[PDB]
Design a protein around this ligand. Structure first.
Ligand code: HEM
Ligand code: HEM
Ligand code: 226
Ligand code: 226
Ligand code: 226
Ligand code: 226
Lengths: 399, 399
């Protein structure tokens, strides 16, 4: 049994891969780690095959972590009822039916036109005002909030409120209770809205979920836990796309490539998803229910195991020159959105948003580039999801 | 003619009546003043009868002011086309018809129910969080803007954007170049919104304006000047009511009076409007069109003339014991909203908003009191409209 490994929190002002995670990947296909909080240590799969396996083997459960105190990254751990993250079959499957409808390819394709309009409105704004604009605050943050509020079914009279609440994405940590405050309201709002819509025939989430509730498909107690994440999910697109524009803005070569292929940015966008370190460490562990051996390691039942999709995505035996950014990279089977039934509920929704963002920004902000040195862009700290806090930009205007 | 009097802008942290305006009021009915900017001096009428007459006489025009550089309180003066303020018959009339229908008594009543729910939501918020709350930022600031964006007809997904921009009201000012930024965005949005809605039946201001534009009744170029003031006109409510409450929170007698007369606060709200010095100095002057003589004084054609509704409102001959906040006051024909064709377009809307705030706040926040000593409440400086910048309050919460 390899020694336990201390794994601190990252303090790097950039997209660089975690130096301490680089270590463990070299230590062996399975390691034991001690995160900033919680008690004890946990296993960590680092290899692609191992990662893809664990994540899809019924032998490991998520439900059992709620009932414990496995070492984690977050200081606090209070799992809500109904969260897809900690639901196992047949529960994970049940809860999913009350919301997955509005997250399908077809529902995303149906949503695309409206989304493009919202994005274009935010773009008109920065364009009317003139050249110096913080893209994060003016486009990356609000755009995802707005599109998702469409998917969720947020009523008109409450667009501003839910927008403002959700805008508790924080500048980084601009408030401990100041964020609990926003969640407090939002969650009171959601529980109510689900009560209303007891049995409405709506394709939007807040109706489907409502109906399912008033029909015992998913009675209350599971509302917030099921809808909270989705309603707040947009923030994930804000950071990730934030990282992509940063790379584009500081690596002129990539920007070039991206501008040269309108209509064929697919592989480039997938190469960015693979390379970028979306999370700071590892989260959402799994519990080894009935004693198992992983890649030659013995994992006794009851012991927690973390998987690193970031590490997996740099698997030498799966992605040659894994550290190099390709953009044209062949099939590219990255695990950015996870693997299994816990696969990202918003994978497709998030991908369509990323596309509009990259396409609209390159089309409508010519001469786009950092308004200040890269070194001046601060990065989020003490957060699960990595990303730039701002992205000051300039672009051509008038002589 | 009387000597030219220098009337500086003043820094008064409280609702006190402008002292220099007090000196000017006893110096006689028609004095001459020199405001901080512009060129030369201007006539100033202080008597009720003179103020009402001058304000209703066709021999005084507003348009001509747009061509001159009359002494003024504002550092820069750049009148926009389509402005009711500076439009004379028939333009003023033509402009008003295109938007006035949304500010009628009947329209306000129809709006009332919805305004109440908006206010109740904001109040739910502070009640949920607990006592310490700055009434200005949490209620008086957002309430007016929200109701006015309903009256104006802002989408919903755009509301959050309009408000953010509209906040070019800030606190005294957060920046000049920044203010001319927020409106660069807001006025671009207004222009575009109006262009769309070319053919619209809508009751909205934007919609009605767009139909008038398309019909060439008040075509483009005039849109921003006409709608701009209305879209941002809500702050007038934010600051006037801020003064009302400040008086209630610092003068027990007043508070007890208002709390003991629910359903009959009518004369008390009017007395506040009369007493409260809503703006600093005087603002929109008129040009003498055909040489006139007022209250004995001869004003040569071409000379500018300012009137003071605040001074008119303290006329001993019309309001015995003028400086005493009486309430219960008989007719009380105060001119807080001006008089004549330029009468406040939003008089009724503002009044309805004021009735809801006072009523809802007194009812929903039992024991409402300042959380800090009065002297800690800071006041707006270098600003046309007067008012408290914040109102930290507390109220009965728990055992
Ligand atoms: C491109 C940005 C995004 C990335 C990279 C991403 C990535 C991921 C990953 C890796 C997981 C699985 C974690 C695990 O099980 O260990 C996940 C789960 C999830 N994501 Fe995302 N996500 C993104 C955007 C979103 C958005 C916009 C939403 C909401 C509309 C969302 C909702 C969810 C939910 C609800 C889960 C839990 C699924 C379950 O376990 O049943 N994600 N995401
Ligand atoms: C209780 C708060 C308010 C007070 C005390 C007030 C007072 C006044 C006064 C005294 C005038 C005349 C200025 C002059 O000619 O010297 C005026 C004009 C005007 N006000 Fe207000 N107002 C208030 C709220 C509002 C609101 C909320 C709006 C927007 C819906 C608004 C829109 C206007 C417009 C457009 C004019 C110019 C009218 C014209 O010349 O045709 N006001 N107001
Ligand atoms: O709706 C929530 C979302 C979260 O991310 C939460 C969290 O991270 C920690 C908690 O203690 C919570 O209670 C959380 C609640
Ligand atoms: O509701 C969640 C959405 C996500 O995208 C998550 C994620 O990407 C990684 C996690 O460890 C999570 O716990 C996530 C939870
Ligand atoms: O609310 C305002 C918006 C403007 O664009 C203004 C302006 O351009 C010139 C003025 O003198 C103003 O007083 C203006 C006031
Ligand atoms: O265009 C204006 C709108 C207002 O609400 C005004 C006001 O409230 C007070 C004034 O002295 C004004 O001069 C005002 C002018």
């Amino acid at each position: 049994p390899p020694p336990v490994r201390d794994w601190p929190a990252l303090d790097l002002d950039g997209p660089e891969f975690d130096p301490v995670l680089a270590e463990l990947m070299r230590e062996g296909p399975l390691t034991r780690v001690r995160l900033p909080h919680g008690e004890g240590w946990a296993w960590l799969a680092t290899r692609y095959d191992d990662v893809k396996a664990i994540t899809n083997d019924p032998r490991f459960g998520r439900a059992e972590v709620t009932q414990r105190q496995i070492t984690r990254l977050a200081p606090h751990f209070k799992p809500r009822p109904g969260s897809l993250a900690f639901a196992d079959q047949p529960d994970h499957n049940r809860l999913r039916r009350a919301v997955a409808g509005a997250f399908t390819v077809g529902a995303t394709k149906r949503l695309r036109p409206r989304a493009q309009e919202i994005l274009d409105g935010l773009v008109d704004g920065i364009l009317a005002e003139g050249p110096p604009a913080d893209l994060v605050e003016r486009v990356l943050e609000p755009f995802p909030i707005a599109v998702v509020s469409e998917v969720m079914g947020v009523p008109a009279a409450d667009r501003e409120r839910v927008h403002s609440w959700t805008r508790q994405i924080i500048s980084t940590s601009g408030g401990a209770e100041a964020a609990e405050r926003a969640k407090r309201g939002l969650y009171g709002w959601i529980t109510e809205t689900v009560r209303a819509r007891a049995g409405s025939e709506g394709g939007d989430v807040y109706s489907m979920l409502g109906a399912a509730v008033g029909r015992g498909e998913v009675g209350e107690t599971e509302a917030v836990g099921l809808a909270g994440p989705l309603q707040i999910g947009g923030e994930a697109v804000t950071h990730n796309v934030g990282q992509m524009l940063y790379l584009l803005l500081t690596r002129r070569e990539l920007m070039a490539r991206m501008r040269e292929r309108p209509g064929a940015r697919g592989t480039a966008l997938d190469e960015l998803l693979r390379w970028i370190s979306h999370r700071t460490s590892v989260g959402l562990a799994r519990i080894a229910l009935e004693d198992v051996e992983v890649h030659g390691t013995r994992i006794a039942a009851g012991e927690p195991v973390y998987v690193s999709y970031l590490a997996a995505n740099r698997d030498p035996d799966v992605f040659p020159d894994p550290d190099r950014i390709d953009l044209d990279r062949d099939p590219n089977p990255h695990l950015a959105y996870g693997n299994g039934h816990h696969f990202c509920t918003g994978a497709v929704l998030a991908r369509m948003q990323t596309e509009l963002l990259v396409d609209t920004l390159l089309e409508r902000l010519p001469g786009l580039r950092l308004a200040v040195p890269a070194e001046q862009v601060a990065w989020r700290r003490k957060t699960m999801i990595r990303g730039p806090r701002t992205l000051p930009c300039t672009w051509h205007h008038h002589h």
